[PDB]
């Protein structure tokens, strides 16, 4: 009915991950920064979890880019920072978290472009 | 102790890569345990990693015997999630090529089953017709079997100017080939001894076990998705649904032959009723514009760029869409999260349930009876393993 | 609407019973099957004399890939990387830089023919008819490495097959 | 509290009992596996490999995780008994074709950028 | 609005809503939510303890005879506390209808196996266990079905890498096929295709 | 300003297509 | 084809049908491998005037599913998911095969 | 306090006086389409893309430059707003060159994305497009001025942020060109930023030309070391 | 009077009216043990009373078959047996009780 | 060509006995047809 387990959640032994990719990896939990080439903000809504970058080398034939770690393309998406922290904790990964960078509200005024005595007056349109 | 034997993967009657572990007393079968996953390529995760257009090619491959039907099922799901609608000519082309695909699958299923039973000649006779239908596929799309012709907005290209006439020429003669097959197989007493009262499944058990398609219709259940839940233009064509009475291999074989005849009927109706117009939905935000407009119009170039780089977004939601594929009810449960890549794509293939019920189907039978029962279930392992 | 396939009973009049007994004792239907096989024996076989004869194809056929040129000799490819982005198999690898004369051209255009699925999406996505799937299909190799095409191999393929590729495009570009 | 429901074992003791049952089963099966699969290892090698695999996750203190581990162990044992596994699957426990990765700082520094 | 837009069907929407209300009234102990999607698909979100009752009702009630189990799958959503979402799709031949049942579970909580209600689930549940790690309590024969023998991990998991962890090759020294850590000659190239502009205003979430 | 040319069935219709089974008697008593 | 008439008679008697009427091999009744160019009509939304996209936007009319019976929040006849399916008719074309 | 109550699609929010319609809308999560408005530059109001309908008001307003009045109900998804956005997008694409395959702004174009989201999908423009000659402003910023949409973002950035007044507009009507009017290099320690603010491929990076497409690149967040500002 | 009902494993039932009456009476008796406020009891009692009334008022098997909309009266008997078994199971389960547990805060929220 | 034969057997090629550098009396292959005759021979067109 209810055993009332009093242990911290830990599923590292059930996931089939080699211990090299559990004790050595360092995950990064963050809200991605806006692409400065565009003005849309729709890619800065959800939290993301990624892994540290590992070695990439040039494969002798065709000069392609080879890698040896399996978690190089793994990016997870979460609604909240607490959810990502819980996932990383229960999966055994050590994480670093960065707080969300929200742009502060500005004070825009069209009339300031034509100020009578202030420096904000524009010299062209 | 019962002798344990491995049937497949490298076996003539294993139908590809199926490992069957069977416990035999003598040649009696005590228990069949199918081992699958020898053709599991992780299609669903890969689909999760592609766009909606990029994932279309995977669908033909799930069942490589009736490739066009698979794309249509997927296309219907994406269209339902998109809340758009293909033009009438696209739908008529879809149904025509679906009937051609049903013909291909039935010929393959019936002939291979006969080959396993030991009747070699029928397979050779009908694969020339299969070659002609592959010619039709290649003419319409450029590939003999992996056309990727049916898209989630309609079809890719219009038919070449001399295709309907050739389809008519083939259809007006296919009946005699069917008749020769039936002459060699239907009334033969060896065939009846091999197939009658072998693998009998009751209607209630067939329903509970998840069977669909002929495996239902062979037990007397009056069910067909083209009649009860029609999708493209199937409510505008007339055909009959063959119904069995005994539930054995012989009834299912007769049902498949009659299904080929009815699909010839539907092909005739589609040939006579093909309408004019465009071939894909006239919405450049879903289907790519013509190559002539992409090179002259700025909006067309922008939409072509964004469709072939990012792909169209699909509004968030989950659907389960099923069609009456030649092997049974073929379904897809598609989950979208508002992105241009599907969040989840579960594929339901009737071969899964049929192979699951094979063990119940082969109770009290011999080894050759088990070979026959494997043949009669119309199993392809690309759709079983995914 | 539906029909039955195995719901007929035989008549039990003495003539029909005797006919059925004659069929059982004399193997009439087996003789009919033998006759059908014998009839197929005296027909003309549907076999073609490969390699001296070839099966039919169409202008839309997808075969070996090729990179095309303009009539002046300039390459059509501009390194827009649309084919690489659309490839379902991730078989295309592209690297580009400004040329010595300032043109936007590739320095690397690699196609893995063993990753490729020959779907033709690349020639659909291309906006300048640069990359095409040609008509050739007899290009089997004795080693895996020979199926890893670089830019030089694809350009040689284009130079070799242009005379037919242009005709095939001319016969089908109105359907696209 | 926590409103959690068990799989098989209510407490730690039942989980340990199931673990010991699984250990007995594997210990019994090892010689038959060595004979049937025609392995080139000794019975002692197989048994101490079983012990090592059991001890690899001896730090678990959650009865539910222990129950799931025992279930997976039963799955593997049933696969080995019925000869569903092949010789390659059995020898994949020994890593006979893998070079021993160094564990000290200096060798890792010499080899590459991977810590 | 006519040519390219999919047409709506109000009658089926009303029928499905009425039947969802009927089912929710009949089984208040387990039913948590009912939805009817705009393409006329009926979904019922229930509590994990009600998998056997609800399904049994939906299979046996005279007004709701769903004798066919079309599909049974799971969906992985890492951000939820209960990670996995179990989905049952049922088809009623008598009333020519389809219904969906949804429930939830985590990595360690088992779910009652529905082999007594539907034989078809027998393999389906196995598949779930193979690819998601969800344990089904009273399954007569639960084991891997699709993955390789002695395959560790559950591939259809969001944290599982696409190419896995091990790859196979024949080694001549030992004269067998061996598994070694995966090493790709060309790494899978990750594409960031998401547009930075909102596409559908109707699905906008409140910014809290 | 040319007309629209497309793959269409010929005016009227296509000829009838036989699909029913044709198994003669072809035997003595 | 080109078979001798005696061989034709032998084939017709052996098969029981007239093979000369329907041959599996194609000789000259197929379409020519070269065809005239097509014209391929445009479509419904190729108008210049009454063609604002917001009036033909299928993706933007999709809305989230209707929520009935949220748990958080008299006759009452029993209902079915749909009216019962009707019995199929027995194929006036060919009822028994 | 002194906050006023306004409505976005019938949803109540309280905003400071002097807040424009765009900021009030973005306080509820809705991003108004824009081309010439940059929150760190002075308001321009010329691209005309941010037009929205106020309830009971017959004329659409420029959301980037119109302060909200108390009680206004902004209708960001009304028929009038969508028609205004479609018309403005069509006018913007009337003279734009078909350069997307050769433009370095392929997957990062605000013009492309906003055409895909708020514009139409066809063209009824049967005339011939305009072409303007290219300018040379140094070895860092590459200019292809046919792609310009005359948003005057670079001019405002140079005037206010960079502090040099080299950039401007010459001519008028259709024949209005953004440039320097003389062979002058726009050289400044902040000269490169005009590449980022420019929403189209009119101004691009010259060292970066033709090397990559944005969907290919992996982005890693890091810290500058070239000075002590970090 | 009728042979070969059509479905495999379904046996043609002689005297089907008596069997149907017995099954419906048994269903009603089982439902009598369920609390009156339970919606399941009232709904299935209403449908069972309607079906029993239609069974009592039609002696012809074909006319009853058409009126029932039950699809091959043997199937009606099978459905009655299924409903009786479900009624016993539901009497054991007691699903008319209030909701056992409320889901977590964002369990069913999609997208993400 | 011989139009009296059925489709697939109405067009054929007799290969040369000596290609660029190798003797080809016995070892012929289908890759020796040049592209124009390749298009004609595969029934991709009606014109040589
Ligand atoms: C039996 C007696 C032998 C004569 C014989 O076979 O005639 C068959 C002769 C050919 O009929 P067919 O093959 O149906 O007609 C196809 C064209 O004639 C096809 O005619 P074709 O233009 O392709 O000419 C090919 C020609 C040249 O081909 C050859 O030289 C190679 C065949 C030599 C085989 C030894 O074949 C022959 O001249 C030799 C025929 C067989 C004689 C040996 O048919 C009969 O005369 C029937 C006679 C009674 C049979 C019952
Ligand atoms: S044919 Fe398809 S798989 Fe092959 S390179 Fe082109 S896009 Fe990629
Ligand atoms: S081949 Fe075509 S699509 Fe590919 S990069 Fe070159 S121009 Fe672009
Ligand atoms: S600026 Fe944008 S729309 Fe213009 S050509 Fe470049 S990518 Fe295309
Ligand atoms: S160059 Fe760019 S930033 Fe400057 S006015 Fe033109 S589009 Fe705007
Ligand atoms: S953003 Fe408001 S007019 Fe330009
Ligand atoms: Mg720019």
Short mmCIF file of N, CA, C and O in Angstrom, two decimals, chain B residues 281-286 289 293-313, chain H residues 89-90 93-94 96-101 106-107 111-113 115-124 129 213 215:
data_model
loop_
_atom_site.label_atom_id
_atom_site.label_comp_id
_atom_site.label_asym_id
_atom_site.label_seq_id
_atom_site.Cartn_x
_atom_site.Cartn_y
_atom_site.Cartn_z
N UNK B 281 -2.17 20.98 -52.17
CA UNK B 281 -2.97 22.06 -51.59
C UNK B 281 -2.37 23.40 -51.98
O UNK B 281 -1.15 23.61 -51.88
N UNK B 282 -3.22 24.31 -52.45
CA UNK B 282 -2.77 25.62 -52.91
C UNK B 282 -2.51 26.55 -51.72
O UNK B 282 -3.14 27.59 -51.54
N UNK B 283 -1.56 26.13 -50.90
CA UNK B 283 -1.14 26.87 -49.71
C UNK B 283 0.38 26.75 -49.65
O UNK B 283 0.90 25.72 -49.22
N UNK B 284 1.08 27.80 -50.08
CA UNK B 284 2.53 27.75 -50.18
C UNK B 284 3.22 27.66 -48.83
O UNK B 284 4.43 27.42 -48.79
N UNK B 285 2.49 27.85 -47.73
CA UNK B 285 3.06 27.68 -46.41
C UNK B 285 3.07 26.23 -45.95
O UNK B 285 3.60 25.94 -44.88
N UNK B 286 2.49 25.32 -46.73
CA UNK B 286 2.50 23.89 -46.45
C UNK B 286 3.15 23.11 -47.59
O UNK B 286 4.05 22.30 -47.37
N UNK B 289 5.90 25.80 -53.61
CA UNK B 289 5.41 26.37 -54.87
C UNK B 289 6.07 25.70 -56.07
O UNK B 289 7.05 24.97 -55.95
N UNK B 293 7.49 29.52 -60.33
CA UNK B 293 7.22 30.66 -59.46
C UNK B 293 8.32 30.90 -58.45
O UNK B 293 8.54 32.05 -58.04
N UNK B 294 9.01 29.85 -58.02
CA UNK B 294 10.12 30.01 -57.09
C UNK B 294 11.24 30.86 -57.70
O UNK B 294 11.99 31.51 -56.97
N UNK B 295 11.35 30.87 -59.02
CA UNK B 295 12.41 31.60 -59.71
C UNK B 295 11.97 32.96 -60.23
O UNK B 295 12.76 33.62 -60.91
N UNK B 296 10.75 33.39 -59.95
CA UNK B 296 10.29 34.69 -60.43
C UNK B 296 9.64 35.51 -59.32
O UNK B 296 9.63 36.75 -59.38
N UNK B 297 9.10 34.85 -58.31
CA UNK B 297 8.35 35.50 -57.24
C UNK B 297 9.15 35.48 -55.95
O UNK B 297 9.72 34.45 -55.58
N UNK B 298 9.18 36.62 -55.26
CA UNK B 298 9.93 36.73 -54.02
C UNK B 298 9.28 35.91 -52.91
O UNK B 298 9.96 35.19 -52.17
N UNK B 299 7.95 36.01 -52.77
CA UNK B 299 7.25 35.23 -51.76
C UNK B 299 7.43 33.73 -52.00
O UNK B 299 7.62 32.96 -51.06
N UNK B 300 7.36 33.31 -53.27
CA UNK B 300 7.54 31.90 -53.59
C UNK B 300 8.94 31.43 -53.22
O UNK B 300 9.10 30.33 -52.69
N UNK B 301 9.96 32.24 -53.51
CA UNK B 301 11.32 31.85 -53.16
C UNK B 301 11.49 31.76 -51.64
O UNK B 301 12.12 30.83 -51.14
N UNK B 302 10.93 32.72 -50.91
CA UNK B 302 11.03 32.69 -49.45
C UNK B 302 10.36 31.44 -48.90
O UNK B 302 10.90 30.76 -48.01
N UNK B 303 9.18 31.10 -49.43
CA UNK B 303 8.45 29.95 -48.91
C UNK B 303 9.13 28.64 -49.29
O UNK B 303 9.16 27.70 -48.49
N UNK B 304 9.70 28.56 -50.49
CA UNK B 304 10.47 27.38 -50.87
C UNK B 304 11.68 27.21 -49.96
O UNK B 304 11.95 26.10 -49.46
N UNK B 305 12.41 28.30 -49.72
CA UNK B 305 13.56 28.27 -48.81
C UNK B 305 13.15 27.75 -47.44
O UNK B 305 13.77 26.82 -46.91
N UNK B 306 12.11 28.34 -46.85
CA UNK B 306 11.74 27.98 -45.49
C UNK B 306 11.09 26.61 -45.40
O UNK B 306 11.15 25.98 -44.34
N UNK B 307 10.46 26.14 -46.47
CA UNK B 307 9.89 24.80 -46.45
C UNK B 307 10.97 23.73 -46.57
O UNK B 307 10.86 22.67 -45.94
N UNK B 308 12.00 23.98 -47.37
CA UNK B 308 13.03 22.97 -47.56
C UNK B 308 14.19 23.09 -46.58
O UNK B 308 15.04 22.19 -46.55
N UNK B 309 14.26 24.15 -45.78
CA UNK B 309 15.26 24.23 -44.72
C UNK B 309 14.70 23.90 -43.35
O UNK B 309 15.17 22.98 -42.69
N UNK B 310 13.68 24.64 -42.90
CA UNK B 310 13.07 24.42 -41.60
C UNK B 310 11.88 23.48 -41.66
O UNK B 310 11.74 22.63 -40.77
N UNK B 311 11.05 23.59 -42.68
CA UNK B 311 9.82 22.84 -42.76
C UNK B 311 8.66 23.58 -42.13
O UNK B 311 8.82 24.52 -41.34
N UNK B 312 7.45 23.16 -42.49
CA UNK B 312 6.25 23.78 -41.97
C UNK B 312 6.02 23.35 -40.53
O UNK B 312 6.31 22.21 -40.15
N UNK B 313 5.53 24.28 -39.72
CA UNK B 313 5.16 23.95 -38.35
C UNK B 313 3.78 23.32 -38.32
O UNK B 313 2.91 23.63 -39.13
N UNK H 89 3.69 43.71 -45.59
CA UNK H 89 4.67 42.71 -46.00
C UNK H 89 4.75 42.62 -47.52
O UNK H 89 5.85 42.48 -48.08
N UNK H 90 3.61 42.71 -48.20
CA UNK H 90 3.60 42.71 -49.66
C UNK H 90 4.35 43.91 -50.21
O UNK H 90 5.14 43.78 -51.16
N UNK H 93 8.07 43.30 -49.82
CA UNK H 93 8.61 42.32 -50.75
C UNK H 93 8.39 42.70 -52.21
O UNK H 93 8.78 41.93 -53.09
N UNK H 94 7.77 43.85 -52.49
CA UNK H 94 7.55 44.25 -53.87
C UNK H 94 8.87 44.40 -54.63
O UNK H 94 8.98 43.95 -55.78
N UNK H 96 12.07 43.60 -53.22
CA UNK H 96 13.16 42.83 -52.65
C UNK H 96 13.72 41.87 -53.70
O UNK H 96 12.96 41.30 -54.50
N UNK H 97 15.04 41.67 -53.74
CA UNK H 97 15.62 40.77 -54.74
C UNK H 97 15.56 39.31 -54.33
O UNK H 97 15.61 38.97 -53.14
N UNK H 98 15.46 38.45 -55.33
CA UNK H 98 15.38 37.00 -55.12
C UNK H 98 16.79 36.45 -54.85
O UNK H 98 17.42 35.80 -55.68
N UNK H 99 17.27 36.73 -53.64
CA UNK H 99 18.66 36.48 -53.29
C UNK H 99 18.83 35.50 -52.14
O UNK H 99 19.96 35.31 -51.67
N UNK H 100 17.76 34.86 -51.68
CA UNK H 100 17.86 34.01 -50.49
C UNK H 100 18.92 32.93 -50.60
O UNK H 100 19.65 32.73 -49.61
N UNK H 101 19.06 32.19 -51.71
CA UNK H 101 20.15 31.21 -51.79
C UNK H 101 21.55 31.81 -51.66
O UNK H 101 22.44 31.16 -51.11
N UNK H 106 20.26 33.73 -44.63
CA UNK H 106 19.34 32.66 -44.98
C UNK H 106 18.38 32.22 -43.90
O UNK H 106 17.18 32.46 -44.00
N UNK H 107 18.89 31.59 -42.85
CA UNK H 107 18.03 31.13 -41.78
C UNK H 107 17.89 32.10 -40.62
O UNK H 107 17.30 31.73 -39.60
N UNK H 111 12.92 39.25 -42.25
CA UNK H 111 12.02 39.36 -43.39
C UNK H 111 11.44 38.00 -43.76
O UNK H 111 10.23 37.87 -43.95
N UNK H 112 12.29 36.98 -43.85
CA UNK H 112 11.82 35.64 -44.19
C UNK H 112 10.84 35.11 -43.16
O UNK H 112 9.76 34.63 -43.50
N UNK H 113 11.21 35.20 -41.88
CA UNK H 113 10.37 34.64 -40.82
C UNK H 113 9.04 35.37 -40.72
O UNK H 113 7.99 34.73 -40.56
N UNK H 115 7.56 37.06 -43.15
CA UNK H 115 6.77 36.68 -44.32
C UNK H 115 6.12 35.32 -44.11
O UNK H 115 4.97 35.10 -44.50
N UNK H 116 6.85 34.39 -43.49
CA UNK H 116 6.29 33.06 -43.25
C UNK H 116 5.20 33.08 -42.18
O UNK H 116 4.32 32.21 -42.19
N UNK H 117 5.25 34.03 -41.25
CA UNK H 117 4.31 34.07 -40.14
C UNK H 117 3.13 35.00 -40.36
O UNK H 117 1.98 34.60 -40.13
N UNK H 118 3.37 36.23 -40.80
CA UNK H 118 2.32 37.24 -40.86
C UNK H 118 1.97 37.69 -42.27
O UNK H 118 0.93 38.32 -42.45
N UNK H 119 2.80 37.38 -43.27
CA UNK H 119 2.53 37.80 -44.63
C UNK H 119 1.70 36.78 -45.39
O UNK H 119 1.26 35.76 -44.86
N UNK H 120 1.50 37.08 -46.67
CA UNK H 120 0.79 36.18 -47.57
C UNK H 120 1.78 35.15 -48.12
O UNK H 120 2.94 35.10 -47.71
N UNK H 121 1.34 34.33 -49.07
CA UNK H 121 2.19 33.30 -49.64
C UNK H 121 2.40 33.44 -51.14
O UNK H 121 3.06 32.57 -51.73
N UNK H 122 1.88 34.48 -51.78
CA UNK H 122 1.97 34.64 -53.22
C UNK H 122 2.39 36.07 -53.55
O UNK H 122 2.53 36.92 -52.67
N UNK H 123 2.60 36.33 -54.84
CA UNK H 123 2.90 37.66 -55.33
C UNK H 123 1.93 38.01 -56.45
O UNK H 123 1.69 37.19 -57.34
N UNK H 124 1.38 39.22 -56.40
CA UNK H 124 0.65 39.79 -57.52
C UNK H 124 1.40 40.96 -58.14
O UNK H 124 0.80 41.83 -58.77
N UNK H 129 11.62 44.89 -60.79
CA UNK H 129 12.13 45.36 -59.51
C UNK H 129 13.21 46.43 -59.72
O UNK H 129 13.73 46.62 -60.82
N UNK H 213 25.75 28.36 -42.74
CA UNK H 213 24.34 28.65 -42.58
C UNK H 213 23.96 28.53 -41.11
O UNK H 213 24.48 27.66 -40.40
N UNK H 215 21.49 27.40 -39.28
CA UNK H 215 20.95 26.17 -38.70
C UNK H 215 22.03 25.13 -38.45
O UNK H 215 21.82 24.23 -37.62
#
